């Protein structure tokens, strides 16, 4: 079971590590029991008044989608090329 499971276990760990790292975005920097200070501060700020998931300006967003399309075209061209000079296609 170890020999046949290790790889899928590692992939699952990477997926879980994503969520674990995302959990720290809203997590206060103070550990318990000092986290009561952070909880009170946030509650008071809410009552009185991220690296991930960012919105970009229109120009940069268009540039990035154009770059993505160019990279996809390169990927497809490389796939079709490595298919075209394969041994079976040559035969």
């Amino acid at each position: 079971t170890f020999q046949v499971v290790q790889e899928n276990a590692d992939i699952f760990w990477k997926f879980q590590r994503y969520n674990l790292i995302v959990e720290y975005h809203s997590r206060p920097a103070l550990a318990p029991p000092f986290i009561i200070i952070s909880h009170i501060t946030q509650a008071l700020l809410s009552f009185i008044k991220d690296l991930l998931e960012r919105e970009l300006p229109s120009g940069l967003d268009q540039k990035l989608m154009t770059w993505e399309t160019v990279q996809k075209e390169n990927y497809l061209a490389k796939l079709e090329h490595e298919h075209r000079e394969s041994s079976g296609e040559r035969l």
């Binding site: 268009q62 770059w67 399309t69 160019v70 990279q71 075209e73």
Partner: protein, 374 residues
Amino acid sequence: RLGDIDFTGVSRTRGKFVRVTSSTDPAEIYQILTKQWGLAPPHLVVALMGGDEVAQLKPWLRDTLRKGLVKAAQSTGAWILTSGLRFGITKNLGQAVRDHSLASTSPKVRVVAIGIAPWNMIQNRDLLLSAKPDHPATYPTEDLPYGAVYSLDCNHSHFILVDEDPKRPGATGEMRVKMLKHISLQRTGYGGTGSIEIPVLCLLVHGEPRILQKMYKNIQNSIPWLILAGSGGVADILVTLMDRGCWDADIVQELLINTFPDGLHSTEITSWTKLIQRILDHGHLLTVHDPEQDSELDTVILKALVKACKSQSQEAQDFLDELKLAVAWNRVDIAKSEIFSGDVQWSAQDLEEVMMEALVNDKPDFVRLFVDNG
């Protein structure tokens, strides 16, 4: 006369322009392009002729054409001279150039799309007539049918607006030919204390009989020409007449009639047949690009340039810029088959410069070739 454009529409693009007349010298416009706008002297110039007719190319043909042109121009710094009006193949090539510019991670190399358009065929020229240096003029980009007057292409970075000549309403093609000759006669510095010509090529897509005089004048000016296979018009006539091998008055007239029903006049058709026959009689400046079989635009450009210069002269020092362009495209096979074929004597001093640029630019195959060749 100099100005700037703030294109309003799909994308906000900043473009410049110059208003010129048929009386101005091309050298002044070249100096403006080099200095006043910061455009470095290119390693390749590709002129676009035709493609403004009612019938546009098939989507696959124009896509493969634009992709091949942009990929061949990105290895070096090249100008793609177009008719800077947003319609048809010019619009598609401008869009491809803009896409390459946006997707490029290296800004040192630049593919510049320069538009040479008449003043009397532009939408809303009065809007840009002011061109305040402090506040650039704003231009709305409108898509239009074939019509008779177009709008400036937004994706074209720079423009050269030619003013209509009262004597003859054909100053646009005349100025295009004059500029093609002038850049073809430039000698940019090569490495250190070296003189390198600028290779200048003309590509024809779906030509019309009206541009035969301009095409012949570019043939006279030693400008190699490249012909698309399935372009549709004069390109089909030229490729058929090349495949047949022998062109006569009857064949040329019959093909012109079959492709162009409209032309029915003894003098006009006779002049067009004479132009076709003489252009084919040149021959060595003419090349056929068939994307269904070629699939490599840089290869056919290199072959056309090598054939043109090989017919021009035999000395090694003239193949220097074709060899540099082959180095930039990593076309070692063509270099050893056509340039290093034994018909040309290569010394060590001649090969030293190209050795230096091949060694600097990460081209091991050419390093090995130059070590093997002296």
